[PDB]
Design an enzyme around this catalytic site. Sequence first.
Site, PDB file in Angstrom:
ATOM      1  N   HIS A 197       0.745  -1.455  -0.203  1.00  0.00           N
ATOM      2  CA  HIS A 197       0.062  -0.078   0.003  1.00  0.00           C
ATOM      3  C   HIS A 197       0.755   1.274   0.059  1.00  0.00           C
ATOM      4  O   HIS A 197       0.744   2.206  -0.941  1.00  0.00           O
ATOM      5  CB  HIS A 197      -1.012  -0.233   1.230  1.00  0.00           C
ATOM      6  CG  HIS A 197      -1.909   1.060   1.183  1.00  0.00           C
ATOM      7  ND1 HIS A 197      -1.725   2.069   2.074  1.00  0.00           N
ATOM      8  CD2 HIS A 197      -2.936   1.199   0.473  1.00  0.00           C
ATOM      9  CE1 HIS A 197      -2.965   2.932   1.849  1.00  0.00           C
ATOM     10  NE2 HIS A 197      -3.803   2.502   0.860  1.00  0.00           N
ATOM     11  N   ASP A 201      -6.286   1.438  -1.999  1.00  0.00           N
ATOM     12  CA  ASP A 201      -6.938   1.157  -0.784  1.00  0.00           C
ATOM     13  C   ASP A 201      -7.795   0.182  -0.985  1.00  0.00           C
ATOM     14  O   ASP A 201      -7.867  -0.885   0.025  1.00  0.00           O
ATOM     15  CB  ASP A 201      -7.852   2.516  -0.663  1.00  0.00           C
ATOM     16  CG  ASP A 201      -7.048   3.695  -0.299  1.00  0.00           C
ATOM     17  OD1 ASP A 201      -5.896   3.618  -0.185  1.00  0.00           O
ATOM     18  OD2 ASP A 201      -7.689   4.836   0.167  1.00  0.00           O
TER      19      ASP A 201
END
EC number: 3.1.1.4
Lengths: 122, 122
Positions: free
Chosen positions: B47, B89
Site C-alpha cells: 500500500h 485502498d
Amino acid sequence: HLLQFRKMIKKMTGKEPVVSYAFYGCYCGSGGRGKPKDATDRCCFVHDCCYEKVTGCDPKWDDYTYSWKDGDIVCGGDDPCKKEVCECDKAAAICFRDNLKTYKKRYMAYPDILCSSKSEKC
Amino acid sequence: HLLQFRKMIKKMTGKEPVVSYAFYGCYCGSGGRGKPKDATDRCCFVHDCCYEKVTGCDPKWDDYTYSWKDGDIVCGGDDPCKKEVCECDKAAAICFRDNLKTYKKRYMAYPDILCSSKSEKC
Ligand SMILES: O=P(O)(O)OC[C@H](O)CO
Ligand SMILES: [Ca+2]
Ligand SMILES: [Ca+2]
C-alpha cells in the site's frame, strides 16, 4: 548502536536527544516519509540514507568503536562496516550541531500523518 | 482519503481499522522501515509503495469516488489519479481480509524502534 549515537548528539548539541530529536519532523526516529520539514529534519533524512548504504552489520544495534579528541568524534576499530555506521552517526551529530540555530520546538513531536505522501529519494 | 480507506478496512475485515491496523507491524500507518513482519504488514508495505507511485493528487487527503456493488468495492469517477488511490485502498483492504488467518495481536502495536535497519525496496 543508537545509544552511542545519542551520546554524540548530546555532547555536540547539549540537548537530551530522547526528548529533542527522537520524534522530530518527518525523518528523525521512526523510519520516515515525505519531505524533510527543515534542516534538522534533513540531518535525519541524510542519516537514514547513510544507513541504507550500510550492509553486513546492524547500524541500530551493533556497537562500534569511537572516542573523543578535542570535542571531535574519532571512529575507530578494525571492522569497516561498523566504522561506516560510526561515521554516519558522527556526520548526523555534526549536522544537528550545525543546524541547531534553526531547531524548532513545534517540530519536536511532528505528527507523522502530516508528512507528505511522496518521499524525497536519497 | 484515509477515512475512505478506513471504511473499506472495517467493511472487509470486521475490525476497527484504527485499533487494528494503524500501528500494525513495521509498515501499517505512517511511514515504515525494515522488513514487513508478516503478510498483513506486507499488505501495508505494498500500500505504501502504491501511494508513493501516485502523482498529481494527494492519496491521504483527497476524496475519491467509490461505491459498493453486491458487497464489493467499486472504484469510480473520471479522475485517474484519484481512481488509482481508490484501487490502492481497495487492494489493501482485500489483502487485510485475505490475511486475517495470520493477523497477530503481538504485532498490533509494534514499536517502530524494533523494526529491522534494512528496509525492503518497492
Ligand atoms: O535514538 P536517538 O535518541 O539517538 O535519536 C534518534 C535519531 O535522531 C534518529 O536515528
Ligand atoms: Ca528515521
Ligand atoms: Ca506505512
